[PDB]
């Protein structure tokens, strides 16, 4: 019945991670719908380059722009390293205690990168770090921090596993780095459309029925 | 001994299957080396953006520009759908009966898509598809070919354990796609400095030490 070409953005660690296989079960039970999907982790500008839904993670206050924002989740990040470079680096009871830490950084090479801490009675901490290693995938990250290159900050969801196996260790357990809300932002006449409608849906469906963290 | 920074790029798929581990490790052992790392599928121009080592994945024939081209391996690509779709929409014999399947596409969207097929007695067959699906990230594609809601082209690699598993099917076995050349271009001169030296002796090394098709 739903009929039709539905253009979609989504970060990358997210899509592989959660994203794919909503898509591929709608997909599955929508045969005339066509998914064009950019798999990016830039900033998408839905009304200039016409998409129908553009999934962000991004950290509150979010845009109050025109689009209609739908809220998908909320996901908590952490600092980790492995025990190897906690071994070698010292203890960490306060922030201060990471200045001159190796670390890693999330993005482009050019920005600056501060880590954003709040922690017992309401104590603000921003630790700048020059990271050794720069780049947007997530998974290369990971790599690094259970080799001992140095302290990153990843989303929770994304090393679990590791935290579970004690191949990384959460570093200043008692701070608390801002979450991040996933959310899907789309122009209110394209969700209007009957086939965008139904995708916007599946995946309100879906996210609602995970009790991620 | 290794110092300074190394500005390297590399596709997606490639960097989370095989490469991401290796920089990791290659950056455990050189504590003084900074990597930039971006993680792109996009053509890279090594010379004008100033990158110090571009990772390629194409098929031959291969760029003769100026810059200096070393071989790290080929991987093969073949067509797979699952049970399921299979069941639902014929035999396949010849190239010909591809024509009307459902299929996904690796790609963007205004992209023209068409498997180019080399069969018995040197026989060519060019299918061109429409594909339902279209995206940039292996991942996603893999998913919904499971889930059967097209055919699609990946690599080998990418599909060993679904195909050992049945969940995945490869379509038109006595045929055979251009097979892709894993490679690394970099300019003359950057690759005399020390530091991009050790990361490309590194990756040749640890390339050479895969037997991976
Ligand atoms: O919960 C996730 O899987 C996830 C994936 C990517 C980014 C993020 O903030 C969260
Ligand atoms: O062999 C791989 O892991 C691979 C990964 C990405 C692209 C490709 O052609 C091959």
């Known amino acids: 019945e739903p009929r039709g070409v539905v253009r979609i953005t989504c970060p990358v660690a997210l899509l592989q991670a959660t994203v794919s296989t909503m898509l591929a079960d709608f997909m599955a039970s929508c045969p005339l719908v066509t998914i064009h999907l950019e798999a990016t982790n830039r900033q998408v500008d839905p009304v200039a380059e016409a998409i129908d839904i553009a999934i962000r993670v991004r950290p509150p206050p979010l845009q109050n722009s025109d689009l209609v924002l739908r809220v998908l989740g909320n996901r908590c990040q952490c600092?980790?390293?492995?025990?190897?470079?906690?071994?070698?680096?010292?203890?960490?009871?306060?922030?201060?205690?990471?200045?001159?830490?190796?670390?890693?950084?999330?993005?482009?090479?050019?920005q600056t990168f501060i880590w954003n801490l709040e922690g017992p009675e309401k104590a603000h901490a921003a630790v700048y770090h020059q990271?050794?290693?720069?780049?947007?995938?997530?998974?290369?990250?990971?790599?690094?921090?259970?080799?001992?290159?140095?302290?990153?900050?990843?989303?929770?969801?994304?090393?679990?596993?590791?935290?579970?196996?004690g191949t990384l260790v959460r570093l200043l357990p008692d701070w608390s780095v801002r979450h991040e809300?996933?959310?899907?932002?789309?122009?209110?006449?394209?969700?209007?459309?009957?086939?965008?409608?139904?995708?916007?849906?599946?995946?309100?469906?879906?996210?609602?029925?995970?009790?991620?963290?």
């Open 131 to 165: 990271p050794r290693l720069v780049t947007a995938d997530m998974n290369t990250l990971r790599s690094a921090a259970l080799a001992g290159v140095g302290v990153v900050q990843l989303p929770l969801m994304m090393v679990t596993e590791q935290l579970a196996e």
């Open 181 to 213: 809300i996933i959310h899907a932002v789309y122009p209110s006449r394209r969700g209007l459309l009957p086939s965008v409608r139904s995708v916007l849906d599946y995946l309100v469906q879906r996210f609602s029925q995970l009790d991620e963290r």
């Open 79 to 110: 600092l980790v390293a492995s025990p190897e470079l906690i071994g070698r680096q010292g203890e960490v009871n306060t922030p201060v205690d990471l200045t001159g830490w190796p670390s890693l950084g999330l993005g482009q090479p050019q």
